[PDB]
Amino acid sequence: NNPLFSPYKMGKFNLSHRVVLAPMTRCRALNNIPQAALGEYYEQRATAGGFLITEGTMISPTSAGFPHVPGIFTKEQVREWKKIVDVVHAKGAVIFCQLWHVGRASHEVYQPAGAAPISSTEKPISNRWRILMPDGTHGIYPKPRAIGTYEISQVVEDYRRSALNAIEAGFDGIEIHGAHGYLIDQFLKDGINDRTDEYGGSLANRCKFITQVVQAVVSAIGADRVGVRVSPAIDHLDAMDSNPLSLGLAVVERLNKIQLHSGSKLAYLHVTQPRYVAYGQTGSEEEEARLMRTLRNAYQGTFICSGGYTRELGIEAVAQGDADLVSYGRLFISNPDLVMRIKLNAPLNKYNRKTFYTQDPVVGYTDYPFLQ
Ligand SMILES: Cc1cc2nc3c(=O)[nH]c(=O)nc-3n(C[C@H](O)[C@H](O)[C@H](O)COP(=O)(O)O)c2cc1C
Ligand SMILES: CCOC(=O)/C(=N\O)C(=O)CC
């Protein structure tokens, strides 16, 4: 009776329900090494036939813009990820590793040798935004270094190698974080990308980087193990575009083309609701709904929606055909058994923003209780 619990074939993965763990940075992976705490956390939230997406994971030493976020670019990181994937698979869940490069959304403190973060541009995020520092204070986003096309090709290889490392750790697949003003989105958004070479200017040129990243990982591990996350309209880290809908449709067209040329469909397209922001709660609601349905209708495959969803809104999204899967973030922080609570329509427990990004392996992380 609940459409969130009708099964869904996500390529080769048979999911038993459509409630997805959205990718959430939590900063418990001390020194960028996956910790046992992550295993307990993902294990708590894993269900038989349920789909989990990990926190954004570094693809290279320049990828981070948060403290104690995990990487998957070293063999040490792969070894520790394997233990976490093992306990998630022990419960019959499917798990993808989100590959995350923040680009200009970093700080000297997070870069090797304190170097400038890399980006499409030299323009910094404005002082409207602040970066969380390792000591819990807020820092200023610095001026990034605009990389050339050889360096771009090396970042693409960082995605390729990290996708292979994810498969070696036992992940079922990876998600490309191409959203929220991070590195890929710094190429996509014409409010950021001021390049005059073949990666800037036109919409085709601005889409080159994400196309090359997706093509690289598809070639490496197979289309059916690759999800792609974008957010054509978002209020995060000055990632504006003059025509968000056309930008989204240009990206979708390239994903459709990659699928045709590879003869296989991606695992999914994951799109953030424009209402979702990092700095608080929640143009017009109809324009935002138009954008989501337009992208879904344009994409030849599985659509995951995310951002501000509740039990009722997730049911509606699946019932109306607005999405195939619904990913939940904050409610999954505070309800380890969110899937069961949604099935039972049991009351949900509140989440505590204060411990979203702290380092404690337990407090605010794995000590939210299950249903009594
Ligand atoms: C603490 C926190 C960390 C997040 N980290 C990521 C991330 O690393 N990568 C990403 O794509 N989205 C990230 N998100 C956005 C979520 O994936 C998800 O889309 C969002 O939380 C959905 O909205 P909801 O919290 O109302 O369910 C994060 C959200 C929160 C609250
Ligand atoms: C508001 C959209 O941005 C996000 O959700 C996000 N990463 O993708 C973060 O907040 C970094 C922790």
Author numbering: 9 to 290, 296 to 385
In the authors' words:
The biocatalytic reduction of the oxime moiety to the corresponding amine group has only recently been found to be a promiscuous activity of ene-reductases transforming α-oximo β-keto esters. By studying the crystal structures of enzyme oxime complexes, analyzing molecular dynamics simulations, and investigating biocatalytic cascades and possible intermediates, we obtained evidence that the reaction proceeds via an imine intermediate and not via the hydroxylamine intermediate. To gain more insight into the reaction pathway, we determined the crystal structures of the two enzymes OPR3 and XenA in complex with the oxime substrates 1a–c, either by co-crystallization or by soaking. All the crystal structures obtained had a high resolution (1.9–1.35 Å) and showed clear electron density features for the oximes.
In general, XenA structures showed a better-defined electron density for the substrate when prepared by soaking, while for OPR3, clearer results were obtained by co-crystallization. As an additional aspect of the crystallographic study, the structure of XenA with 1b might explain why only XenA efficiently transformed substrate 1b, and OPR3 did not. A closer look to the active site of XenA revealed a pocket delimited by the residues A57, I66, H178, H181, and Y183, which is not present in other previously investigated enzymes. Therefore, the presence of this pocket in XenA might explain why it is the only enzyme able to reduce oxime 1b efficiently and why oximes with substituents larger than an ethyl group are not accepted as substrates. Remarkably, a non-canonical tyrosine residue was found to contribute to the catalytic activity of the ene-reductase OPR3, protonating the hydroxyl group of the oxime in the first reduction step. For OPR3, a non-canonical tyrosine residue was suggested as potentially catalytically relevant for the transformation of oxime substrates.
